UniProtKB/Swiss-Prot annotation, chain A:
The keyword RNA-binding applies. It comes from Mycolicibacterium smegmatis (strain ATCC 700084 / mc(2)155) (Mycobacterium smegmatis). This is Large ribosomal subunit protein uL4. Part of the 50S ribosomal subunit. Belongs to the universal ribosomal protein uL4 family. The gene is rplD.
Curated annotation (Swiss-Prot), chain B:
It comes from the Bacteria. This is Large ribosomal subunit protein uL24. HAMAP family: Ribosomal_uL24_B. CDD domains: KOW_RPL26 (cd06089). GO terms for biological process: translation. One of its GO terms (molecular function) is rRNA binding. The gene is rplX.
Length: 209, 97
RNA sequence: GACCUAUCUUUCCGGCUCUACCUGGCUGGAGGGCAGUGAGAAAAUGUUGUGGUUAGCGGAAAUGGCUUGGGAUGGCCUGCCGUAGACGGUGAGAGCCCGGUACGUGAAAACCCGACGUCUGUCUUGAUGGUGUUCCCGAGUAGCAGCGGGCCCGUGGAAUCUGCUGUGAAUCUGCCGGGACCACCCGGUAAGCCUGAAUACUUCCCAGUGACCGAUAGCGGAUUAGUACCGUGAGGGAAUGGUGAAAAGUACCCCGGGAGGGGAGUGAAAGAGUACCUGAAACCGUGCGCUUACAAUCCGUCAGAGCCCUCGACGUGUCGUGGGGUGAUGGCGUGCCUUUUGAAGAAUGAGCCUGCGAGUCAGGGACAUGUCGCGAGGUUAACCCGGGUGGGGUAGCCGC
RNA sequence: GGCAGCCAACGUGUUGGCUGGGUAGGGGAGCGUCCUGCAUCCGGUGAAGCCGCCGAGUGAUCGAGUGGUGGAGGGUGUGG
C-alpha cells in the first residue's frame, strides 16, 4: 500500500487514497508489456493498403501475338507481372492486424505499468483540475505545473467532468482518458499519471472488488 | 478578403517590411494585393525602349490594415442592428475603418 | 365454430319489419369509449417544434527584440491566448500573419421528421351453462403409382420436400408429421391471404481516415483518355507532371536569312532561359599525361624497366616504413549463367545502360519448435457497452 | 602472425587441444533499403541525392571523415 495525498487546485490537501498492492505493487514484466503494447498498436493500424493482381488490371485478356514464329519471348497477357503496367505479385492487400490477446495478459500489463509509476512516485491524485463550471486552460496549466514538471502527463477523469477535460485538452503533452479505458500504452507513454479522486476510486473499485 | 482596394496597409513581411502604402487593386481569387510603392520589379518592356519599374502583387497575409491611430491591426466585425450591417472594426481600438 | 336450449346481468332517443300485444331482428341519430394511414380500412387538410437537410456568419492571443538570409515561418531571448497546440497557406519548421480550428450562431423558400388537431373508421350486452349416430371446418386437393429434381443422403431399407404424367379420399371415430412399414402414444391442424425489426448492397451526394501509391508507381486515364491510334465490326487501346518567392520570361547593342549565340540587363542563383528543380548510367566529343606500327593478347593476374604526378626529410637531386597514373618485358591463365556423367566449349540465354520483374496473404485451420500469461485447469464465439487499442459476454472448444 | 567452429580447463573471458575444400540441401549469425511507436540529435551558418578525395571492417558494406555540385529535409538508439 502506497498513500497518495489528494491535492486541490486551491493548493490544499483534502485527504489520502490508499493504493492496493494487487494493483500498484505488481512486479513489471517487460516482455508481457511489450506484447500487449504492440498488440494495441497493431489494432490501431488500419489495413487499407491494396494493389491489383494480373487479373484485376484493366484489359490483358487476349494473347498478344502467336506462341511461335515471331522471334520474341512468348507472352500470355500484356498485364503479366514482368510487363510495365502489369499486375503486382504478392503485393499488399487489405488486412486486419488486431490480435486476440488474453484478458489476463492485458490486465496484468496495465497493473505492471501503473505499479512502475507508483514505485517512482509518478501517481498523483486531485479533487478537480479546475474550480467551478467554466473551462480554463490557464488554471489547469498552472496547477499541473505545480504537480509535475515533466512534459507528458496522462490525466484520468470521469466521464462527467467535461470542464476538467476541456481545460486540459489543449495542452501539448497532456493526454486525457477515462478510468474504464485505461491501457498500458498510454500509461507507459506518460511521465506522470494524474487521477481525479472519483476516477481513481472507480478504477480501484472495479478491480479490487 | 479583409483588405480592400483603397485601404492603407503596413507591410509586415518581405523585403519591404515596414513600408506603408495604398491598396491599388485586390485579387481575391489568389489572396494578393497590389500596394503602391512596395515590391517593385525592373521589367523589360519590349516594343520605343522600355525598362520600367512597376509594383508586383504581394500576398495579403503579408500586409496589415493600419488603424486610425497609425498602428497595424487585425480587423474583426461588429453587427449594426439598425441595417443588419457588418462593419469592419480594428481589434486594437474597436473603432471602425 | 354454427345450430339448438337454461341462467344472470345490462345508456338514451327513434325508425322499420301488414294490424295491434308480447317478441325477435335489422337500421338511423345522440352520450360515451377505442384505433388510424400501418400488416391490421382510405384519401385528405390546418396549426405547431431553436426538430433535421439544402447557402452561410462570428470567433482568443506578437507589425516583439537581436542574429542569419533574397525572403524568417530558422537560431537565441522575451511576452501573450488556449473550450482554439486540427489541417492547410503565407518568400525556409507559424497556437498569436492569412483560410480556419474550439465553441457558438443563422433559413425567405422547398423538402424531411415529428406533435397536435380536424378528418376517417370502428364499437357499444355481455357473461354463463347444458344438449346432440345434427351441420361446418379451404378438392381434382391430400394420398397412391411412374419418371425426375432436391435434401448429409450419388436409389439406397429412403422418410420429409418438390415438377410432369396417370389414378384419386375422408370434415374430427377426420386428416398429416415423429427416416421403410405396423401398432400405441405424442405433436400439429394442409390444400386462402397479409405482415415491421434484426440481414445484404452503394451508380450517386456529404464529412473524414491511412506504419496506402507518389508519375515505368497509383485507376487504362495527375497531361484534350476511353482521347490519339488499331480493327469492317464486336472489341483492343497508349504516351506526355516540377522555371522562379515573384514573370521580374532576357529592353538595347553585336554575328547570322533564320536558328543559335556573345555582350548588357532581371534574379539569392540563369551551375534556374518557357529545350527550364535535382541532373546518375549507357552512349558521343575536346584537351593533357603515359603507352603502342617484328606482333599471335578470355584481355586479367603476379613479378617489373622506363616516364609522369604527388607527400615527407635533406639540398642544387636523392632517398623513404611512402602514395598515385602509365607500363616495355617475363611467369601463370579455357568468359558468365542454365543444364549435364562431363561444357572455354562449335549446347541454352544475354547488344549496352537505367528503371521494373518471382515462397505472399487469409483461417481460434493442421503438425512441430521458440516465447509469454495462467495452471488442474486454460480460453472465450457471436454479441453488448466505450469516438480506441478498454471492459463485459460460458454458448462452445481443448485437458481431466 | 591473424580469424573462426567444437570441446576442455579454469576464471567473473581468457588459456589450451582438435577442427575449419564443397554442388543439392539443413542449421546459425549478420549487412544494406523503405515505412513506422518511443526517445534523442543535425540542418538555408546548407538536409537528401549525385560526383570525388582520403581512409575503414572478416563479408554483405561503412564514413556524426572531409572537398565539389545541390536546395529542404535528414541522422542515431531501441522496438513494430
Ligand atoms: Mg474498363
Ligand atoms: Mg482477365
Ligand atoms: Mg491464355
Ligand atoms: Mg499497376
Ligand atoms: Mg475482449
Ligand atoms: Mg522565429
Ligand atoms: Mg501546422
Ligand atoms: Mg384446414
Ligand atoms: Mg435426388
Ligand atoms: Mg410418416
Ligand atoms: Mg408473402
Ligand atoms: Mg522521377
Ligand atoms: Mg500511369
Ligand atoms: Mg479482324
Ligand atoms: Mg475506323
Ligand atoms: Mg542553386
Ligand atoms: Mg532536356
Ligand atoms: Mg536541369
Ligand atoms: Mg616495336
Ligand atoms: Mg604460341
Ligand atoms: Mg600457357
Ligand atoms: Mg549429353
Ligand atoms: Mg549434377
Ligand atoms: Mg555459347
Ligand atoms: Mg564460341
Ligand atoms: Mg537442349
Ligand atoms: Mg543469343
Ligand atoms: Mg581459440
Ligand atoms: Mg566450409
Ligand atoms: Mg582443409
Ligand atoms: Mg547449399
Ligand atoms: Mg542510409
Ligand atoms: Mg541562401
Ligand atoms: Mg527520405
Ligand atoms: Mg527490423
Amino acid at each position: 500500500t502506497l498513500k497518495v495525498d489528494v491535492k486541490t487546485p486551491a493548493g490544499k490537501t483534502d485527504g489520502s487514497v490508499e493504493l492496493p498492492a494487487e494493483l500498484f505493487d505488481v512486479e513489471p514484466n517487460i516482455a508481457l508489456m511489450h506484447q500487449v503494447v504492440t498488440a494495441q498498436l497493431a489494432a490501431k493500424r488500419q489495413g487499407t493498403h491494396s494493389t491489383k493482381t494480373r487479373g484485376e488490371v484493366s484489359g490483358g485478356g487476349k494473347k498478344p501475338y502467336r506462341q511461335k514464329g515471331t522471334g520474341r519471348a512468348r507472352q500470355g497477357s500484356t498485364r503479366a507481372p514482368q510487363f510495365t503496367g502489369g499486375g503486382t505479385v504478392h503485393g499488399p492487400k487489405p488486412r486486419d492486424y488486431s490480435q486476440r490477446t488474453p484478458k489476463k495478459m492485458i490486465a496484468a500489463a496495465l497493473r505492471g505499468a501503473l505499479s512502475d509509476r507508483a514505485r517512482n512516485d509518478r501517481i498523483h491524485a486531485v479533487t478537480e483540475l479546475v474550480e467551478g463550471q467554466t473551462p480554463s486552460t490557464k488554471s489547469a496549466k498552472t496547477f499541473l505545473g505545480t504537480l509535475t514538471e515533466n512534459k507528458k502527463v496522462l490525466v484520468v477523469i470521469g466521464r462527467t467532468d467535461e470542464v476538467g477535460a476541456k481545460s486540459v485538452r489543449n495542452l501539448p503533452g497532456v493526454h486525457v482518458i477515462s478510468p474504464d479505458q485505461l491501457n498500458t500504452y498510454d500509461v507507459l507513454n506518460a511521465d506522470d499519471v494524474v487521477f481525479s479522486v472519483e476516477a481513481l476510486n472507480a478504477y480501484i473499485s472495479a478491480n479490487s472488488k | 478578403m479583409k483588405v480592400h482596394k483603397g485601404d492603407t496597409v503596413l507591410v509586415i513581411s518581405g523585403k519591404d517590411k515596414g513600408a506603408k502604402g495604398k491598396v491599388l487593386v485586390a485579387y481575391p481569387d489568389r489572396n494578393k494585393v497590389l500596394v503602391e510603392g512596395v515590391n517593385r520589379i525592373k521589367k523589360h518592356t519590349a516594343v520605343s525602349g522600355g525598362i520600367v519599374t512597376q509594383e508586383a502583387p504581394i500576398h495579403v497575409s503579408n500586409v496589415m490594415v493600419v488603424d486610425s491611430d497609425g498602428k497595424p491591426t487585425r480587423v474583426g466585425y461588429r453587427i449594426d442592428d439598425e441595417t443588419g450591417k457588418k462593419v469592419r472594426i480594428a481589434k486594437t481600438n474597436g473603432k471602425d475603418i
